[PDB]
Design a protein around this nucleic acid. Structure first.
Ligand SMILES: [Mg+2]
Ligand SMILES: [Mg+2]
Ligand SMILES: [Mg+2]
Ligand SMILES: [Mg+2]
Ligand SMILES: [Mg+2]
Ligand SMILES: [Mg+2]
Ligand SMILES: [Mg+2]
Ligand SMILES: [Mg+2]
Ligand SMILES: [Mg+2]
Ligand SMILES: [Mg+2]
Ligand SMILES: [Mg+2]
Ligand SMILES: [Mg+2]
Ligand SMILES: [Mg+2]
Ligand SMILES: [Mg+2]
Ligand SMILES: [Mg+2]
Ligand SMILES: [Mg+2]
Ligand SMILES: [Mg+2]
Ligand SMILES: [Mg+2]
Ligand SMILES: [Mg+2]
Ligand SMILES: [Mg+2]
Ligand SMILES: [Mg+2]
Ligand SMILES: [Mg+2]
Ligand SMILES: [Mg+2]
Ligand SMILES: [Mg+2]
Ligand SMILES: [Mg+2]
Ligand SMILES: [Mg+2]
Ligand SMILES: [Mg+2]
Ligand SMILES: [Mg+2]
Ligand SMILES: [Mg+2]
Ligand SMILES: [Mg+2]
Ligand SMILES: [Mg+2]
Ligand SMILES: [Mg+2]
Ligand SMILES: [Mg+2]
Ligand SMILES: [Mg+2]
Ligand SMILES: [Mg+2]
Ligand SMILES: [Mg+2]
Ligand SMILES: [Mg+2]
Ligand SMILES: [Mg+2]
Ligand SMILES: [Mg+2]
Ligand SMILES: [Mg+2]
Ligand SMILES: [Mg+2]
Ligand SMILES: [Mg+2]
Ligand SMILES: [Mg+2]
Ligand SMILES: [Mg+2]
Lengths: 144, 99, 51, 118, 142
RNA sequence: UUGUGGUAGACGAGCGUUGUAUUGGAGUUGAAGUCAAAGCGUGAGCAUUGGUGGAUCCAAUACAAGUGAGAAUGCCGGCA
RNA sequence: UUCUCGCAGUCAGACAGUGGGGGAUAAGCUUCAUUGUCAAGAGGGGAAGAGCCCAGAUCAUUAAAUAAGGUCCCCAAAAUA
RNA sequence: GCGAAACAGUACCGUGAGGGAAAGGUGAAAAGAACCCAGAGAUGGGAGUGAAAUAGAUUCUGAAACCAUAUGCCUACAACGUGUCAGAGCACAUUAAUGUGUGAUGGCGUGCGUUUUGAAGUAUGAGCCGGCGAGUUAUGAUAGCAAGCGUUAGUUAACCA
């Protein structure tokens, strides 16, 4: 027999954060956003207690897609009907709804789970410099 | 204050007056055993193992773990074998850390 | 030997009886040692001697 | 001599039923479904003992990897430095140190960092 | 202090009687009688008779106040069935199962009556453990 | 020291049921049955206590079997 | 793995590599020779796969080093040029 | 066990020959519940007899499937062979045991027999529970093991007591 390891008993050290996606790549921003949301980078990681900090993303429309992906890569959404497959190009996503694009990209990098719903909830993505989230006093960190 | 001992094959971090469970040591209850292999003690950590660093422990009980039923079954192959295991342990509490 | 403790010479009385119907744990369950679905596994038997 | 079955079938059946206690509906009531669930549960328990031995190692590796990235060092080089310095400590106890004894865990990383190998 | 009344082999089915019994559990005496006297169901003029008999033998036999009685539990247990052969078409036949219910109504005066039942269960468990300890003491003594 | 995956199959060692023969023992101060519980065994299996029950049962060594049920669109009874 | 005696089961095979026949250098086709696996064999890789690769499960351990394979996230683990 | 422990070759099926069931146990003794209450009554609740009435004629014991009631835990954004390994919180306290009941959440996970090269199987068999249900006997042959008797050995069958 042996000594069991310490696991957090639903302890919430969660904090609020701010990042600026002025010129960040979509994938490079999404991977670090997922890591921050899951709390994998935290010293004590108990993978059933959602010990991950909140995150707010500013300037979503200002993100970039390298190469010809703004006109050659398509995002697909199918309703339960026939023919309800809506397609949007990279440029159209970058203009019409950029917040949804970043939200979907971050969601895709999470495990199929019942906690991933709460994890994707803790991502507040905005398309402008303004945000109604200044009451949380969120700390500012770059490229995360 | 703390030490890293190696009883059996596992490594235990032990404080003063801490009771941990190890594999059977063949020692009667009540004796004063001296664990030899010590990795880290206080702040001086020896690379293979610390020399002369001894962990003094007292054996509390020699009980057995919970019964485990191993039922091997090969589906649609006329093979249903059953077995039981009750692994013996020994519980010991740290008394003093030899300098 | 008394009538309350009477014993045979070892390896003279009791030998392993091959019970053909009592479970697979004895190695003689289900099929009971006949094989599988052929003439020798039916109730008839092993045909004729010399056949 | 007509031997009649009674208390033989029921006892061995109730053992299986007792093992399958806490199941969903008929999986604890009927002997047949209870027997199947116990066998399947035994298979699961066997497989998950092996898988527990591997999954807890992975969790310790993850925690240790995280604890190192805060200081600028990586897991792949930390273990190499540990080997060259002859230090032999489980990732379990090392992770337990980084969660319980931050100062002493930092002491181990400081020695493996720069001190002469052996 | 539970008073009760019973009725074996009631013609109503347990399925159609539990629907009416759930309308009176936990209700006061007068209100339960009022509710059951104006419900257009067959299993309403039979539970009413059982309820009235239970009130009578609670305030006469067991000596209860009569203004504190509430319906503790009214249930319709499964009674013995009767098998008949219904002639089907093309020479076939089916089995009609006439269902009967064993009705029982119980009323109490104390609004904490469940606690005493749990207490009796606990007392039985305690006596079992006490017997085990005395047997252990006897084993070590020898 | 070399080993211990396993179907068809071969070999060896055991458990359990009923009864009989020899010994001993328990039982209206409560036997069998029967239910529950946080026990013991490597496995068939074996105990302890309490409730119900109201008269037989247990241990050892041998012997004889209508001696071991999850499946046969299996039979009967009950209930979904 | 040779000889003697007792008791068998097996006579429907499958796929992968290699050399061919039949087919059309088609078949997850059919028929042979040989090396392996499955049948009767779990584990890891192949996203999922009986037969491909690494190997052979006595039971327990929340110990360590490795094979095929891999190290942005899902998912354990990398950096330089 | 005779099909038939009871009034069984009966009930019942068929024009007929013919086919053919199920069903036992109150208590030592009926002392079988007078009487009161509710109800139309059966009946139920008391009273009484009895050692026992949760032995009450539904009459020895009373298992499971099945149907209801309740203490405690969980459950209405949730992809589920229903379990397993970890795991908070909640509620208790035992064949005193690193205890028990539930399980927010994380990782893994396509039943059992049959027959097939190959079945999670869009092949097959089982609605569930309980009982019954399939390697025997007689006479001989061979082989293994063991015992008795032995080198002019060994052993009786029928039958008699
Ligand atoms: Mg076999
Ligand atoms: Mg054979
Ligand atoms: Mg064949
Ligand atoms: Mg067959
Ligand atoms: Mg054959
Ligand atoms: Mg049986
Ligand atoms: Mg007609
Ligand atoms: Mg029906
Ligand atoms: Mg083997
Ligand atoms: Mg006997
Ligand atoms: Mg008893
Ligand atoms: Mg039989
Ligand atoms: Mg071939
Ligand atoms: Mg062929
Ligand atoms: Mg080929
Ligand atoms: Mg060719
Ligand atoms: Mg060819
Ligand atoms: Mg082929
Ligand atoms: Mg085969
Ligand atoms: Mg394999
Ligand atoms: Mg795989
Ligand atoms: Mg092996
Ligand atoms: Mg390594
Ligand atoms: Mg490599
Ligand atoms: Mg990783
Ligand atoms: Mg007639
Ligand atoms: Mg009465
Ligand atoms: Mg009845
Ligand atoms: Mg009875
Ligand atoms: Mg919810
Ligand atoms: Mg949602
Ligand atoms: Mg899915
Ligand atoms: Mg799940
Ligand atoms: Mg789970
Ligand atoms: Mg699944
Ligand atoms: Mg079988
Ligand atoms: Mg077929
Ligand atoms: Mg076929
Ligand atoms: Mg299906
Ligand atoms: Mg078909
Ligand atoms: Mg068929
Ligand atoms: Mg079917
Ligand atoms: Mg059956
Ligand atoms: Mg012989």
């Amino acid at each position: 027999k042996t000594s069991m390891l310490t696991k957090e008993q639903a302890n919430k050290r969660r904090q609020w954060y701010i990042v600026d996606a002025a010129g960040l790549v979509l994938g490079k921003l999404a991977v670090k956003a997922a890591d921050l949301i899951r709390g994998k980078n935290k010293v004590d990681f108990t993978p059933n207690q959602d010990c991950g900090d909140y995150l707010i993303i500013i300037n979503s429309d200002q993100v970039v897609l390298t190469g010809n992906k703004k006109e050659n890569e398509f995002w697909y959404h199918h309703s339960q009907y026939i023919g309800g497959i809506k397609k949007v190009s990279g440029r159209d996503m970058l203009k019409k709804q950029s917040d949804k694009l970043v939200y979907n990209a971050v969601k895709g990098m999470l495990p199929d789970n019942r906690l991933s719903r709460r994890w994707i909830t803790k991502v507040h993505v905005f398309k402008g410099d303004k945000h109604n989230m200044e009451a949380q006093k969120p700390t500012t960190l770059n490229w995360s | 204050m703390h030490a890293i001992v190696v009883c059996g094959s596992k490594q235990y971090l032990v404080h003063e007056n801490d009771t941990f469970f190890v594999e059977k040591l063949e020692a009667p209850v009540g004796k004063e055993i001296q664990l030899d292999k010590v990795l880290m003690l206080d702040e001086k950590i020896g690379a293979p193992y610390l020399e002369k660093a001894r962990v003094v422990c007292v054996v509390e009980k020699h009980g057995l773990q919970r019964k485990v039923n191993v039922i091997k079954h090969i589906s649609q192959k006329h093979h249903l074998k059953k077995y039981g295991h009750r692994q013996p342990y020994t519980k010991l509490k740290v008394v003093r850390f030899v300098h | 030997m008394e009538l309350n403790q009477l014993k045979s010479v070892p390896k003279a009385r009791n030998h392993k009886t091959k019970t053909l119907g009592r479970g697979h744990g004895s190695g003689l369950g289900k099929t009971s040692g006949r094989g599988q679905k052929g003439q020798k596994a039916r109730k008839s038997g092993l045909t004729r001697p010399g056949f | 001599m007509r031997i009649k079955g009674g208390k033989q079938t029921r006892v061995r059946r109730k053992k299986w039923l007792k093992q399958a206690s806490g199941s969903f509906g008929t999986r604890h009531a009927s002997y047949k479904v209870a027997k199947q669930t116990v066998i399947q549960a035994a298979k699961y328990a066997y497989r998950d003992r092996r898988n527990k031995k591997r999954d807890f190692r992975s969790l310790w590796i993850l925690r240790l990897n995280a604890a190192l990235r805060e200081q600028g060092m990586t897991y792949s080089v930390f273990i190499n430095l540990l080997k060259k310095h002859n230090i032999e400590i489980n990732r379990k106890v090392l992770s337990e140190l980084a969660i319980k004894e931050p100062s002493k865990f930092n002491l181990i990383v400081q020695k493996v960092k720069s001190e002469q190998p052996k | 202090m539970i008073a009760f009344a019973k009725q074996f082999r009631v013609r109503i089915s347990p399925q159609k009687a539990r629907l009416v019994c759930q309308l009176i559990v936990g209700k006061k005496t007068a209100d339960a009688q009022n509710i059951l006297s104006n419900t257009p169901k067959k299993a309403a003029t039979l539970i009413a008779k059982l309820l009235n008999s239970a009130i009578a033998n609670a305030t006469n036999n067991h000596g209860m106040n009569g203004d504190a009685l509430y319906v503790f539990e009214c249930v319709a247990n499964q009674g013995p069935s009767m098998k008949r052969t219904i002639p089907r078409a093309k020479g076939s036949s089916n089995m009609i199962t006439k269902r009967s219910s064993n009705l029982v109504v119980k009323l109490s005066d104390n609004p904490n009556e469940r606690q005493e039942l749990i207490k009796q269960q606990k007392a039985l468990v305690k006596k079992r453990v006490e017997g085990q300890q005395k047997a252990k003491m006897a084993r070590q003594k020898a």
